[PDB]
């Protein structure tokens, strides 16, 4: 059944030579080699770990030793995914039923659900975030409903390796101990992610996957530049799912809607939103991506 989105990829030459369904999406222990440490130490930002201590990175990556840390999905069924961006287009879209009908749902950053479920749904299978944006969302959108990140029995949290805080928070979450060092010292991972503290709950996006995404799909002339978390998440789904629908992502008529679907009234890092919008348009036209528009 996978040959649904894969067929669309091959039928058009442009993306046929741009997709590489072999690069690892997730970083885990069996990939931590002194070779990888050499290269990735020459890149900062989420593209590597220059200036980050071996002790921290080695200690976190030692928890990702299990085979389950390597993949988002476990092993003949079809994988139908929905990626929920936070754009104002979903406001009054009443897309809840369509979003929740998918097998798996990706959400990210300010995934406000209370008060907006009829528009955006309640199902969550994956929650992507940097520690910085997650806590910034808990501060900015607390009154709007976001009093906690989405939780679920079989929900997995996807860490974007944008800063040493992400490794520290990832390491503390798997161990089930409060974060001992760094900017987030004192936080309780259980209060963010719930009672389960295992490697089956928390995953880490591969820095080489992010570099490959930037280089092949979103190499903006702004080149620190990096794609939006939504873009990262959407592209993560494009590489792991058999069909993905995108909701709440920036479109050409973005100006008709508030900044976010959950803002109080109409509201207006280094990203190229115009490039990302053009990517989702081309993916839509090539039939690779179902993009929600109106
Ligand atoms: N107007 C908007 C708002 C958000 N988005 C997507 O939703 C993601 C999450 O938004 P926030 O980080 O504001 O919560 C963004 O990273 C972006 O990819 C969008 O594409 N257009
Ligand atoms: C896919 O990426 C891997 C690196 O992970 C590389 O070795 C391989 O040649 C690439 N294949 C294609 C078709 O781009
Ligand atoms: C659109 O969003 C604004 C704030 O984001 C909200 O006040 C308004 O009720 C929404 N309109 C709808 C859902 O028709």
Global shape: globular
H/E order of the elements? HHHHEHEHEHEHHEHHEHE
Radius of gyration: 18 Å
The hetero compounds bound to this protein are: cytidine-5'-monophosphate, 2-acetamido-2-deoxy-beta-D-glucopyranose
Query: Structural class from helices and strands?
Result: alpha/beta
How many helices? 12
Kindly report how far apart the N and C termini lie.
Answer: 29 Å
Helix content: 25-40%
The tally of beta strands, per DSSP, is 7
- Strand percentage lies at 5-15%
Largest sheet properties? 7 strands, parallel
| Total number of domains | 1
Strand arrangement within the widest β-sheet reads 5-4-3-2-1-6-7
Description of the molecule:
Disulfide bonds join 1-78, 81-241. Residues 1-294 are lumenal. Glycans are attached at residues 20, 65, 91. GO terms for molecular function: alpha-N-acetylgalactosaminide alpha-2,6-sialyltransferase activity; sialyltransferase activity. It is built from 12 helices and 7 strands. The protein has helices at residues 5-11, 13-16, 34-40, 54-63, 96-101, 117-120, 131-140, 164-175, 189-193, 207-216, 229-240, 273-285; strands spanning 80-84, 104-108, 126-129, 156-159, 202-204, 243-247, 290-291. A 7-stranded parallel beta sheet has the order 5-4-3-2-1-6-7, sandwiched between helices. α4 runs parallel beside α8. The relative contact order is 0.19. Bound molecules: cytidine-5'-monophosphate and 2-acetamido-2-deoxy-beta-D-glucopyranose (2 copies). Cytidine-5'-monophosphate binds next to α11. Residues 20, 22-23 line the site of one 2-acetamido-2-deoxy-beta-D-glucopyranose.
């Amino acid at each position: 059944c996978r040959h649904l989105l894969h067929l669309a990829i091959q039928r058009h030459p442009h993306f046929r030579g741009l997709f590489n369904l072999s690069i690892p999406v997730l970083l885990w222990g069996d990939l931590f080699t002194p070779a990888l440490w050499d290269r990735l130490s020459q890149h900062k930002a989420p593209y590597g770990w220059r200036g980050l201590s071996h002790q921290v990175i080695a200690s976190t990556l030692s928890l990702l030793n299990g085979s389950e840390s390597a993949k988002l999905f476990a092993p003949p069924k079809c994988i139908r995914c929905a990626v929920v961006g936070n754009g104002g287009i979903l406001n009054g879209s009443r897309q809840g039923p369509n979003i929740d009908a998918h097998d798996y749902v990706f959400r990210l950053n300010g995934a406000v659900i209370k008060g907006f479920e009829r528009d955006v749904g309640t199902k969550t299978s994956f929650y992507g975030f940097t520690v910085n944006t997650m806590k910034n969302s808990l501060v900015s959108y607390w009154n709007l409903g976001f009093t906690s990140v989405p939780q679920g029995q079989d929900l997995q949290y996807i860490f974007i390796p944008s800063d040493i805080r992400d490794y520290v928070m990832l390491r503390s979450a798997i161990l089930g101990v409060p974060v001992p060092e760094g900017l987030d010292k004192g936080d309780r991972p259980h209060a963010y992610f719930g009672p389960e503290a295992s490697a089956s709950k928390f995953k880490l996006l591969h820095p080489d996957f992010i570099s490959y995404l930037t280089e092949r799909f979103l190499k903006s002339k702004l080149i620190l530049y990096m794609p939006s978390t939504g873009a990262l998440m959407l592209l993560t789904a494009l590489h792991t799912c058999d069909q993905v629908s995108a909701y709440g992502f920036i479109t050409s008529n973005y100006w008709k809607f508030s900044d976010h679907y959950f803002e109080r009234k109409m509201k207006p890092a280094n990203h190229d939103l115009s490039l990302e919008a053009a990517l989702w348009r081309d993916l839509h036209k090539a039939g690779i991506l179902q993009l929600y528009q109106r």
